[PDB]
Coordinates of C-alpha atoms in Angstrom, one line a residue:
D6 CA 14.3 -24.2 -31.7
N7 CA 12.2 -26.8 -29.9
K8 CA 11.5 -24.3 -27.1
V9 CA 9.0 -22.3 -29.2
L10 CA 5.6 -23.5 -30.3
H11 CA 3.2 -22.0 -32.9
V12 CA -0.4 -22.7 -32.2
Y13 CA -3.5 -21.7 -34.3
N14 CA -6.8 -22.4 -32.4
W15 CA -10.3 -21.0 -32.2
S16 CA -10.7 -17.7 -30.4
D17 CA -12.4 -17.8 -27.0
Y18 CA -11.4 -21.5 -26.6
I19 CA -8.7 -21.7 -23.9
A20 CA -8.3 -20.7 -20.2
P21 CA -6.3 -17.5 -19.5
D22 CA -3.5 -19.5 -17.7
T23 CA -3.4 -22.6 -19.9
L24 CA -0.3 -21.6 -21.8
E25 CA 1.5 -20.1 -18.8
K26 CA 1.1 -23.5 -17.1
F27 CA 2.3 -25.4 -20.2
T28 CA 5.4 -23.3 -20.4
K29 CA 6.0 -23.6 -16.7
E30 CA 5.9 -27.4 -17.1
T31 CA 7.9 -27.6 -20.3
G32 CA 10.0 -24.4 -20.9
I33 CA 8.3 -24.2 -24.3
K34 CA 7.1 -20.7 -25.1
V35 CA 3.9 -20.6 -27.2
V36 CA 3.0 -18.1 -29.9
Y37 CA -0.8 -18.4 -29.9
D38 CA -2.9 -17.2 -32.8
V39 CA -6.7 -17.5 -33.2
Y40 CA -9.3 -17.8 -36.0
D41 CA -13.2 -18.0 -36.0
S42 CA -13.7 -20.2 -39.0
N43 CA -12.6 -23.5 -40.5
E44 CA -12.3 -21.7 -43.9
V45 CA -9.5 -19.5 -42.7
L46 CA -7.6 -22.4 -41.2
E47 CA -8.3 -24.5 -44.3
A48 CA -6.8 -21.9 -46.7
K49 CA -3.6 -21.7 -44.6
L50 CA -3.2 -25.4 -44.4
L51 CA -3.8 -26.2 -48.1
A52 CA -1.4 -23.5 -49.3
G53 CA 1.3 -25.4 -47.3
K54 CA 4.0 -24.3 -44.9
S55 CA 1.5 -22.6 -42.6
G56 CA 4.1 -21.9 -39.9
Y57 CA 2.1 -23.7 -37.2
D58 CA 3.0 -26.8 -35.3
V59 CA -0.6 -27.3 -33.8
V60 CA -4.0 -26.4 -35.3
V61 CA -7.6 -27.3 -34.4
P62 CA -9.9 -27.9 -37.3
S63 CA -13.5 -29.1 -36.7
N64 CA -14.0 -32.9 -37.4
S65 CA -15.8 -32.3 -40.7
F66 CA -12.7 -30.5 -42.1
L67 CA -10.2 -32.8 -40.3
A68 CA -11.6 -35.8 -42.3
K69 CA -11.0 -34.0 -45.5
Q70 CA -7.6 -32.6 -44.6
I71 CA -6.4 -36.0 -43.6
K72 CA -7.3 -37.5 -47.0
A73 CA -5.5 -34.5 -48.5
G74 CA -2.3 -35.5 -46.5
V75 CA -2.2 -32.3 -44.4
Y76 CA -1.3 -33.9 -41.1
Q77 CA 1.3 -36.3 -39.6
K78 CA 0.4 -39.4 -37.6
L79 CA 0.7 -38.8 -33.9
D80 CA 3.6 -40.5 -32.1
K81 CA 1.4 -42.0 -29.3
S82 CA 4.4 -43.0 -27.2
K83 CA 4.8 -39.3 -26.5
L84 CA 1.2 -39.0 -25.3
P85 CA 0.9 -41.0 -22.1
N86 CA -2.3 -39.0 -21.2
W87 CA -4.2 -40.6 -24.0
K88 CA -5.7 -42.9 -21.5
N89 CA -7.9 -40.0 -20.2
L90 CA -9.9 -39.6 -23.5
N91 CA -13.5 -40.8 -23.6
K92 CA -13.0 -44.0 -25.5
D93 CA -16.6 -44.0 -26.7
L94 CA -16.1 -40.7 -28.3
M95 CA -12.7 -41.8 -29.7
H96 CA -14.6 -44.7 -31.4
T97 CA -17.1 -42.5 -33.1
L98 CA -14.2 -40.2 -34.3
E99 CA -12.6 -43.2 -36.1
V100 CA -14.8 -42.6 -39.1
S101 CA -13.1 -39.2 -39.6
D102 CA -9.7 -40.4 -38.4
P103 CA -9.2 -44.1 -38.9
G104 CA -7.4 -45.6 -35.8
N105 CA -7.4 -42.1 -34.3
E106 CA -4.0 -41.7 -35.9
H107 CA -3.9 -37.9 -36.4
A108 CA -5.9 -36.0 -33.7
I109 CA -7.5 -35.8 -30.3
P110 CA -10.9 -34.2 -29.5
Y111 CA -10.4 -30.8 -27.8
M112 CA -13.9 -29.6 -27.1
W113 CA -17.3 -30.0 -28.9
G114 CA -20.7 -28.3 -28.8
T115 CA -23.9 -27.4 -30.5
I116 CA -25.2 -24.6 -32.7
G117 CA -28.4 -23.2 -31.4
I118 CA -30.3 -20.3 -30.1
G119 CA -28.6 -17.7 -27.9
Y120 CA -31.0 -14.9 -26.9
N121 CA -31.9 -12.0 -24.6
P122 CA -35.3 -12.9 -23.1
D123 CA -36.3 -9.3 -22.1
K124 CA -35.4 -7.9 -25.6
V125 CA -37.2 -10.8 -27.4
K126 CA -40.3 -10.3 -25.4
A127 CA -40.4 -6.5 -26.1
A128 CA -39.8 -7.1 -29.8
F129 CA -41.8 -10.3 -30.3
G130 CA -44.6 -10.1 -27.8
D131 CA -45.2 -12.7 -25.0
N132 CA -44.2 -16.4 -25.3
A133 CA -41.9 -16.2 -28.3
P134 CA -40.9 -19.8 -29.4
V135 CA -37.4 -19.3 -28.2
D136 CA -37.0 -23.1 -27.8
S137 CA -37.7 -23.7 -31.5
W138 CA -36.0 -23.2 -34.9
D139 CA -39.3 -21.5 -35.8
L140 CA -37.9 -18.5 -33.9
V141 CA -35.6 -17.7 -36.9
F142 CA -36.7 -19.7 -39.9
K143 CA -40.3 -18.5 -39.9
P144 CA -40.2 -15.2 -41.8
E145 CA -43.0 -13.6 -39.7
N146 CA -41.0 -14.5 -36.6
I147 CA -37.6 -13.2 -37.4
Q148 CA -39.3 -10.1 -38.8
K149 CA -40.4 -9.1 -35.3
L150 CA -36.7 -9.6 -34.1
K151 CA -35.2 -7.5 -36.8
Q152 CA -35.8 -4.7 -34.3
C153 CA -33.3 -5.9 -31.7
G154 CA -31.0 -7.8 -34.0
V155 CA -30.5 -11.4 -35.1
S156 CA -27.1 -12.8 -36.1
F157 CA -26.0 -16.1 -37.6
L158 CA -22.5 -17.6 -37.9
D159 CA -20.5 -16.9 -41.0
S160 CA -20.2 -20.6 -41.5
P161 CA -22.0 -22.1 -44.5
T162 CA -21.1 -25.7 -43.7
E163 CA -22.7 -25.5 -40.3
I164 CA -25.6 -23.0 -40.9
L165 CA -27.1 -24.3 -44.2
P166 CA -27.6 -27.7 -42.6
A167 CA -29.8 -26.0 -39.9
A168 CA -31.9 -24.7 -42.8
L169 CA -31.9 -28.2 -44.4
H170 CA -32.9 -29.8 -41.0
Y171 CA -35.7 -27.2 -40.6
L172 CA -37.1 -28.1 -44.1
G173 CA -37.2 -31.7 -43.1
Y174 CA -34.2 -32.8 -45.2
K175 CA -31.2 -34.8 -44.0
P176 CA -28.6 -32.3 -42.8
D177 CA -25.9 -34.1 -44.9
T178 CA -27.9 -34.3 -48.1
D179 CA -26.1 -33.8 -51.5
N180 CA -29.3 -33.4 -53.4
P181 CA -29.1 -30.2 -55.5
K182 CA -32.8 -29.4 -55.1
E183 CA -32.7 -29.7 -51.3
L184 CA -29.6 -27.6 -51.1
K185 CA -31.2 -25.0 -53.3
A186 CA -34.3 -25.0 -51.1
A187 CA -32.1 -24.2 -48.1
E188 CA -30.8 -21.2 -50.0
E189 CA -34.3 -20.0 -50.8
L190 CA -35.3 -20.3 -47.2
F191 CA -32.3 -18.1 -46.2
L192 CA -33.1 -15.5 -48.8
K193 CA -36.6 -15.2 -47.3
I194 CA -35.2 -14.5 -43.8
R195 CA -32.2 -12.6 -44.9
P196 CA -33.7 -9.1 -44.8
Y197 CA -34.1 -9.6 -41.1
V198 CA -30.5 -10.8 -40.3
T199 CA -28.2 -8.0 -39.0
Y200 CA -25.0 -9.8 -39.9
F201 CA -23.3 -13.1 -40.5
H202 CA -20.3 -13.4 -38.2
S203 CA -18.6 -16.1 -36.3
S204 CA -17.2 -14.2 -33.2
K205 CA -18.5 -10.7 -33.1
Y206 CA -21.8 -12.0 -31.7
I207 CA -20.4 -12.8 -28.3
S208 CA -19.8 -9.1 -27.3
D209 CA -23.0 -7.9 -29.1
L210 CA -25.0 -10.5 -27.3
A211 CA -23.4 -9.7 -23.9
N212 CA -23.7 -5.9 -24.4
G213 CA -27.4 -6.0 -25.5
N214 CA -26.6 -4.9 -29.1
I215 CA -28.4 -7.9 -30.5
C216 CA -31.2 -10.1 -29.1
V217 CA -30.7 -13.4 -30.9
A218 CA -27.5 -15.1 -32.1
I219 CA -27.5 -18.5 -33.9
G220 CA -24.1 -19.5 -32.7
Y221 CA -21.8 -21.9 -30.9
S222 CA -23.2 -23.1 -27.6
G223 CA -20.1 -22.3 -25.5
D224 CA -19.9 -18.9 -27.1
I225 CA -23.4 -17.9 -25.9
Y226 CA -22.5 -19.2 -22.4
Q227 CA -19.5 -16.9 -22.4
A228 CA -21.7 -14.0 -23.5
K229 CA -24.0 -14.8 -20.6
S230 CA -21.0 -14.8 -18.2
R231 CA -19.6 -11.5 -19.5
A232 CA -23.1 -10.1 -19.1
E233 CA -23.2 -11.2 -15.5
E234 CA -19.7 -9.9 -14.7
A235 CA -20.7 -6.6 -16.3
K236 CA -23.6 -6.1 -14.0
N237 CA -25.2 -4.2 -16.8
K238 CA -28.6 -5.9 -16.5
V239 CA -28.3 -8.1 -19.7
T240 CA -29.7 -11.6 -19.4
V241 CA -28.5 -14.1 -22.0
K242 CA -29.9 -17.6 -22.3
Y243 CA -29.1 -20.6 -24.6
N244 CA -31.5 -23.3 -26.0
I245 CA -30.8 -26.4 -27.9
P246 CA -34.1 -26.2 -29.8
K247 CA -36.8 -28.9 -29.3
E248 CA -36.3 -30.1 -32.9
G249 CA -32.5 -30.9 -32.4
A250 CA -29.4 -29.1 -33.6
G251 CA -26.0 -29.7 -35.3
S252 CA -23.0 -30.6 -33.1
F253 CA -19.4 -29.8 -34.1
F254 CA -16.3 -31.5 -32.7
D255 CA -12.9 -29.7 -32.7
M256 CA -9.7 -31.8 -33.0
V257 CA -6.1 -31.0 -32.2
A258 CA -3.7 -32.1 -35.0
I259 CA -0.2 -31.6 -36.2
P260 CA 0.7 -30.3 -39.8
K261 CA 3.1 -32.6 -41.6
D262 CA 5.6 -29.8 -42.0
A263 CA 5.6 -28.8 -38.3
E264 CA 8.9 -27.2 -37.4
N265 CA 8.7 -28.6 -33.9
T266 CA 6.8 -31.8 -33.6
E267 CA 8.3 -32.9 -30.3
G268 CA 6.9 -29.7 -28.7
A269 CA 3.6 -30.1 -30.5
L270 CA 3.3 -33.6 -29.0
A271 CA 4.1 -32.3 -25.6
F272 CA 1.3 -29.7 -26.0
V273 CA -1.2 -32.3 -27.1
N274 CA -0.2 -34.4 -24.1
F275 CA -0.5 -31.4 -21.7
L276 CA -4.0 -30.8 -22.9
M277 CA -5.0 -34.3 -21.9
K278 CA -4.2 -33.7 -18.2
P279 CA -7.6 -33.8 -16.4
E280 CA -7.3 -30.6 -14.5
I281 CA -6.0 -28.7 -17.5
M282 CA -8.8 -29.7 -19.8
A283 CA -11.4 -29.2 -17.0
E284 CA -10.2 -25.7 -16.3
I285 CA -10.6 -24.9 -20.0
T286 CA -14.2 -26.2 -20.0
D287 CA -15.0 -24.1 -16.9
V288 CA -13.9 -20.9 -18.7
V289 CA -15.2 -21.4 -22.2
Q290 CA -18.2 -23.6 -21.4
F291 CA -17.9 -26.2 -24.1
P292 CA -17.7 -29.9 -23.0
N293 CA -14.4 -31.6 -23.7
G294 CA -13.4 -35.1 -24.9
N295 CA -11.7 -36.1 -21.7
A296 CA -13.4 -38.6 -19.4
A297 CA -10.9 -38.1 -16.7
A298 CA -11.6 -34.3 -16.7
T299 CA -15.3 -34.4 -16.2
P300 CA -15.2 -34.9 -12.5
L301 CA -12.9 -31.8 -12.2
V302 CA -15.4 -29.5 -14.0
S303 CA -17.4 -27.1 -11.9
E304 CA -20.8 -28.6 -11.1
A305 CA -22.8 -25.7 -12.5
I306 CA -21.1 -26.3 -15.8
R307 CA -21.1 -30.1 -15.8
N308 CA -24.7 -30.2 -14.8
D309 CA -25.9 -27.7 -17.4
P310 CA -28.0 -29.3 -20.2
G311 CA -26.8 -26.7 -22.7
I312 CA -23.2 -27.9 -22.1
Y313 CA -23.3 -31.6 -21.1
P314 CA -26.7 -32.7 -22.7
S315 CA -28.7 -35.7 -21.5
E316 CA -28.9 -38.9 -23.5
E317 CA -32.3 -38.0 -24.9
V318 CA -31.1 -34.6 -26.2
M319 CA -28.0 -36.3 -27.6
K320 CA -30.2 -38.5 -29.8
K321 CA -31.6 -35.4 -31.5
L322 CA -28.2 -34.0 -32.4
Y323 CA -26.6 -34.5 -35.8
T324 CA -23.0 -34.1 -36.9
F325 CA -21.5 -32.2 -39.8
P326 CA -20.3 -34.5 -42.6
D327 CA -17.1 -34.9 -44.6
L328 CA -18.4 -32.9 -47.6
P329 CA -18.2 -33.9 -51.3
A330 CA -16.5 -31.0 -53.2
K331 CA -19.6 -30.4 -55.3
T332 CA -21.7 -29.9 -52.2
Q333 CA -19.1 -27.6 -50.6
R334 CA -19.0 -25.6 -53.8
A335 CA -22.8 -25.3 -54.0
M336 CA -22.9 -24.2 -50.3
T337 CA -20.2 -21.6 -50.9
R338 CA -22.1 -20.2 -53.9
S339 CA -25.3 -20.0 -51.9
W340 CA -23.6 -18.4 -49.0
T341 CA -22.1 -15.6 -51.1
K342 CA -25.5 -14.9 -52.5
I343 CA -27.1 -15.0 -49.0
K344 CA -24.6 -12.8 -47.3
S345 CA -24.8 -10.1 -50.0
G346 CA -27.7 -7.8 -50.1

């Protein structure tokens, strides 16, 4: 039945009327499921017959899934809105997806420091280095924050590179000694981490349950917004630290065994409509991959350096690599050890 579409996307990553408008235009109903990690999506895909027509991996995982033959090539004649994509971004994405054959950029962002300034001051003292990775990777520092709660993503492939970076190593290093050093750094700060989770931190941060979350940029902006709408006195801020940060890029793609491919292509095309993509960015506060959409984004969002960064900040951002299996395996092993008491 080409009038039903099964989508699996990140949580907190669409506008509340996006699907209603898609169905209104197309008559295609959408069953929409959400995840908060690449690993969950990855396991589904690799096992095969996932039951989804559209999924949204990060670009690091997309590159690997493409080589593994997970996705079908997009029929670009069914995607007239392709013209709206930022061509410069599409060029950089060619490394992961030669000829941009399988996917389009949905949204992207950074992994940095979300925090509650009042709670940090009370716990830390005046002038906490809230604009620096030293805030959390210096044991004496995170120790002061243990009091109001510090979270990190449950995402080894995105968090261990922050440790690597902090130690002065390349964030895409495969060197076993550097990787191990990253693990040792985390073990030192681990007693002061309240939890590792990739979505729970939005509510906790908005509600005042924690005072620092190392998380996805747009997520922290949503927490800020929820806080403001709650009128419950919680102030949330986000910094891309002075030293730089990792940047992830999420990509829409179509599993080879998609039951409906025609509808999936319709959905992908619908997402490249300028006003549709801009409305999404307004709500979830991650920049998108659509040059035609930028002008239609609210100016407080488009003009915010934590969402659309300046050229100078861009130069300090790194991407997450297509990982060799041995590195992934080492990272997984470290992450199990780190998460556990």
